[PDB]
């Protein structure tokens, strides 16, 4: 192949089909830049990526502690397809060869990049010294507690792997030895504490030596049916490629959230892979709410954002009427919502398209 004017050089390790599995599998944490020579955003990233690497290597000198690599997606389309690359540059985090769900989507600076790896390499598990601390757990979030006889054990090593992968989705806590023995009657145990004080504890019954099964059970508790959309996760949620069904509500309005999650669970399971069920704090999402001429005072508001348009569910109470919510999402897919929108008039434009990966930040790849 005859080099182009955009031909580049970098000391960052280049991944290819022959070396990728071994390099990634053996890296406790790896940050991989999927890029293309002709991408202006990739071009500006490269020197930032390299300096960040040098900074981080100085703090993590040991082999396979933190590995920085890159993938030329033009030269290795199989690797790009393997990881479902849809934009350049894409920064994926791996742990022991496993790709993490969250990409690096933050500031493209040496400092923000090094901060990120520092946070990710940090131990996320908080060890309990006194079993009285379980009573004072903040039940406004998800908590997973592992009780082990010994930190130097296969059970804890599985738990450590899982916590490292899911710390951004749940709070992990540990308890060992004599602190842990009172709750260790039948051996080591893993307990999920759901948010609130009206939900009982849930106990893991699988093999704690089995990373695959233990990961699946914990990850299942970490993912609700109706996810909260935030400014942080908005890009990721748009990238799942599904239109949004959104409850906008006040943070203190727990009642309408509960009603919504129950009616979704009751009516929309068939639509699981056809629309994304979400809720959003209406004070934080006042700008999207202006797209549908609503204010926090109008909430609770149920809306659809198709990434072309936004549609309003008539009146929140109607969600209690047995067919209504399902008909709303059916009317989306049939084109009826668009057809029947009334003040020939176009419905208002999508607001959440603005949180999707932007041509002002990436080279976007065609569907």
Curated annotation (Swiss-Prot):
Residues 344-352 have a biased composition (Polar residues). The keyword Transmembrane helix does not apply. Residues 217-266 are annotated as: Interaction with ITPR1. Forms mixed disulfides with both ERO1A and ERO1B and cargo folding intermediates; the interactions with ERO1A and ERO1B result in their retention in the endoplasmic reticulum. Directly interacts with ITPR1 in a pH-, redox state- and calcium-dependent manner, but not with ITPR2 or ITPR3. The strength of this interaction inversely correlates with calcium concentration. Induction: Up-regulated by inducers of the unfolded protein response (UPR), including tunicamycin and dithiothreitol. Keywords: Chaperone, Disulfide bond, Endoplasmic reticulum, Signal, Stress response. Mediates thiol-dependent retention in the early secretory pathway, forming mixed disulfides with substrate proteins through its conserved CRFS motif. Inhibits the calcium channel activity of ITPR1. May have a role in the control of oxidative protein folding in the endoplasmic reticulum. Required to retain ERO1A and ERO1B in the endoplasmic reticulum. Residues 11-119 form the Thioredoxin domain. GO terms for biological process: cell redox homeostasis; glycoprotein metabolic process; protein folding; response to endoplasmic reticulum stress; response to unfolded protein. It is found in: Endoplasmic reticulum lumen. SUPFAM superfamilies: Thioredoxin-like (SSF52833). It comes from Homo sapiens. Disulfide bonds join 170-222, 282-299. PROSITE patterns: ER_TARGET, THIOREDOXIN_2. Pfam families: Thioredoxin, Thioredoxin_6. Gene3D superfamilies: Glutaredoxin. It comes from the Eukaryota. GO terms for cellular component: cell surface; endoplasmic reticulum lumen; endoplasmic reticulum membrane; endoplasmic reticulum-Golgi intermediate compartment; extracellular exosome; extracellular region; specific granule lumen. InterPro entries: ERP44, ERp44_PDI_b, Thioredoxin-like_sf, Thioredoxin_domain. This is Endoplasmic reticulum resident protein 44.
